[PDB]
Amino acid sequence: LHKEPATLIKAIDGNTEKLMYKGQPMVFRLLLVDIPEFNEKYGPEAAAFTKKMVENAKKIEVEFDKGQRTDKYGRGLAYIYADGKMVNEALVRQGLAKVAYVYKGNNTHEQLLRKAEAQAKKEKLNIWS
């Protein structure tokens, strides 16, 4: 797979956070994870973690997998990196998201993420506490 550039578009004017990819604003959805919603346990902690990772990055990159690049809502489907650190993996490794939504065809980093889940679960972190 290939990492490609993007920049963070911060939330303003009642809009949501987005990434600018090829010079266009897009909502992205992280591949291979299920993240608690804001009203659920660890929802605020997952949002805060992601926001810190992306806001503090010098360089954001998006890495599409080999299958579909957008979902039925028009969201980009990608692995997102902040200064080389994968956000999808880091969230799962902290127990702030579960491996999920593994569609045949966009599963390149499934095993990496499952190992991070198993380590988060053994360490009884967050959702596994």
Ligand X SMILES: Cc1cn([C@H]2C[C@H](OP(=O)(O)O)[C@@H](COP(=O)(O)O)O2)c(=O)[nH]c1=O
Closest to 36 measured CA to CA, from 53, 54, 48: 48
The yes-or-no answer on residue 29 being catalytic is yes
Q: What is the DSSP letter of 1?
A: -
Q: Which of 29, 114, 115, 121 binds ligand X (CB under 6 A)?
A: 29
- Which position among 17, 75, 110, 114 bears the catalytic label? 75
- Which position among 17, 29, 110, 114 bears the catalytic label? 29
Alpha helical stretches, state H, the chain: 43-55, 87-93, 110-122
The DSSP bridge partners found for residue 8 are 19
The yes-or-no answer on residue 37 being catalytic is yes
Q: How far is the CB of 40 from ligand X (least distance, A)?
A: 12
User: Of the two residues 1 and 59, which places its CB atom closer to ligand X in the complex?
Assistant: 1
Q: Which residues are catalytic?
A: 29, 37, 75
